[PDB]
């Protein structure tokens, strides 16, 4: 019974489906998205922990690779070369590279993490360290905007909330990047807007308006059968509800 | 879905008791029905959809008893149970017994046998259910 779930037809030996159809190809060329794209999984603590591990590992390899490549090239040259003074100079270079790799080994994880806007091989991280389960750009956004330690993850202070409200009014509730910059607590535009919307009287309304009531009544009468109405789905059409 | 919680026990107890009486008369079945007071089953703070699907499944299960391989008096008791369940319901419209195509003809032959057997109580009860059109012409029960 359960064998017939989507896709309805699936290849018996490989499980693949038919190639892209003409209608599907045109729709893709028109940029029409699919419903499967809306499926997103919550960041469990393991996902974050191994993202952190991946970032530290990436930075470690980035720092080490030039040093160890230099050391290995130097050792190859020392092995092939017979000149004594040049051999001693190459040996000294190898000792320097050894000391450099040792102090990099001794560097702390925080120094390895570096700044928020540092460069990383997000593509390689994605497809080799999480096997492509999450997209490289998605991982980049998550890290740089929420997970990197420089992000202000602390709870909002009451003074911070009051100043946020005041400067949001000052900025006309627009350009929330400038709002966050003026707040001065290293907050992001998205954090500021989410916070304001969660305590904005204009969005969440206890009162009512003529257009909201009219459209609620219209949708209710069009859809309602007996006692049932889409209480929480009417919110798509009118603004300021659940 | 299956069966309501406890309905199977009440139905089997009623059918077993009616069998042990060794009587096919409808008087005995109604007397048991009134004594243990089966008709309350359609009360008890069950709402509209609840009465509808409870009656549907109860009628389907009463039909399950009404079918073979159980012998004459068991099927007679099951028909009396079908009559009671349908005529003591409070649905609007009265919900119908789901009966299969494969079962309509066999029940018609059973009604004819009841007529030939001169036990006209069961045949009359089936005809009364037919007048109520208490049954739905379905492919499966």
């Amino acid at each position: 019974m359960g064998h017939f779930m989507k896709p309805y037809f699936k290849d018996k030996v490989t499980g693949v489906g038919p190639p892209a159809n003409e209608d599907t190809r045109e729709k893709a060329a028109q940029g029409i998205k699919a419903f499967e794209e809306l499926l997103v999984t919550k960041w469990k603590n393991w996902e974050k922990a191994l993202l952190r591990k991946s970032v530290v590992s990436d930075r470690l390899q980035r720092l080490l690779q030039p040093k160890l490549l230099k050391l290995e090239y130097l050792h190859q040259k020392q092995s092939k070369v017979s000149s004594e003074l040049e051999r001693q100079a190459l040996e000294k270079q190898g000792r320097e590279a050894e000391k450099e790799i040792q102090d990099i080994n001794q560097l702390p994880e925080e120094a390895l993490l570096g700044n928020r806007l540092d460069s990383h091989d997000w593509e390689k991280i994605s497809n080799i360290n999480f096997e492509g389960s999450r997209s490289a750009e998605e991982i980049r956004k998550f890290w740089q905007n929420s997970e990197h330690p420089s992000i202000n993850k602390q709870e909002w202070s009451r003074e911070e909330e009051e100043r946020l409200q005041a400067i949001a009014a000052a900025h006309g509730h627009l350009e929330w990047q400038k709002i966050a910059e003026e707040l001065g607590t290293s907050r992001s535009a998205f954090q500021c807007l989410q916070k304001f919307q969660q305590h904005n009287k204009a969005l969440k309304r206890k009162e009512w308006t003529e257009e909201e009531d009219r459209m609620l009544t219209q949708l209710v009468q069009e859809m309602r059968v007996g006692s049932h109405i889409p209480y929480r789905r009417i919110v798509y059409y009118m603004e300021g509800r659940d | 879905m299956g069966t309501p919680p406890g309905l199977q026990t009440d139905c089997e107890a009623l059918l077993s008791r009616f069998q042990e009486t060794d009587s096919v008369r409808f008087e005995d079945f109604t007397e048991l029905w009134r004594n243990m007071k089966f008709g309350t089953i359609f009360c008890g703070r069950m709402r509209n959809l609840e009465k509808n699907m409870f009656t549907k499944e109860a009628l389907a299960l009463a039909w399950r008893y009404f079918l073979p391989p159980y012998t004459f008096q068991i099927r007679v008791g099951a028909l009396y149970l079908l009559y009671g369940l349908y005529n003591t319901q409070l649905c609007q419209p009265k919900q119908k017994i789901r009966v299969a195509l494969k079962d309509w003809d066999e029940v018609l032959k059973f009604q004819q046998d009841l007529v030939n057997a001169q036990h006209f109580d069961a045949a009359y009860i089936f005809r009364k259910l037919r007048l109520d059109r208490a049954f739905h012409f379905t492919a499966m029960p």
């Binding site: 956004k141 627009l174 049932h228 919110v235 | 009360c43 008890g44 409070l90 419209p93 195509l101 009860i125």
Partner: protein
Amino acid sequence: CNFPEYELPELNTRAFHVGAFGELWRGRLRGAGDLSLREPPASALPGSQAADSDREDAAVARDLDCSLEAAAELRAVCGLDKLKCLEDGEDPEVIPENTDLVTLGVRKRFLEHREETITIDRACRQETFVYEMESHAIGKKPENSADMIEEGELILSVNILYPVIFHKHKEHKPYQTMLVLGSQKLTQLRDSIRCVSDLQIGGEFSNTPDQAPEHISKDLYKSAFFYFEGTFYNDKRYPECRDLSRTIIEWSESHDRGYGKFQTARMEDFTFNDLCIKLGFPYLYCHQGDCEHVIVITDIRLVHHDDCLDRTLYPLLIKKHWLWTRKCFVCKMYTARWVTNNDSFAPEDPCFFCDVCFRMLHYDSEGNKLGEFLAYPYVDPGTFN
């Protein structure tokens, strides 16, 4: 023979021709009036059968091969007073204690722990849609003569599963149940479905959000087809319609993919009476080139005078599953109307935004683009469910 049999107990049945099955049902009922759409006489208490006695006793005597006095005696014996131990005036909202039913003992056990100030309520019991649609349509008749169900017509129950699927549960399915007539063409069922995929739209509009596409997927594509008994039924009424079945035939017949030989037909060539179909066995439907639905023929029966006879409503909807609205991540409460990718402001990609949050975040008063992001208009299937 077209004799329905269980292929798996209470799960699915063998295949049979709908027309032949309906003809067999009518043959077992034609001329008896049991399949008629006209109100028959009903049972009553023995104290009120005097008016009905003249009409009933003679017919009973004729059918049961018993005397008129025997018919009257049977009627008195089978009086509802012998079974109506509830008075017609008793409310159903209370369990009557004068009973020995185990069922009502269980009902009492259920109700007792629901009378505290925290638990007492008259809320939904387990579902709502079914009875609402029933009471909205049951027993009604059409306002037009041409919209009347034929007496003894077949009623088919068809379930269509939603494109959005749980992927974590398998006992239950997300579906909507329709009722269709034997004589109806499949064109009506194809045209009736209001699937959200028809509302699908595309295009990237971060620079100019107000320039959303003028055409929904329904206005650009019309390819749709049904799948029964190995047959494709593709629509070709319009130039936008394409016979999707040809590509899948080419793909599948070239290799042992686990399915047999297939053949193509149009959508308007068949009525519900022309199909040879199973009950409970899953089947397939598709539209928009890619939006596949699972089709299950849950039930089939002749029409009854108590059923909905108003064909203006047909195809009928009688049961509907639920999908959760896609709430935008900014306020986490309001429903999203926009989604962005590559968005520097957004903490995650993709990020969904409401029409309120989207504009006020990504644009200034003039509507100029702010930051780096790509934005797409979004239609919520959890809303248009």
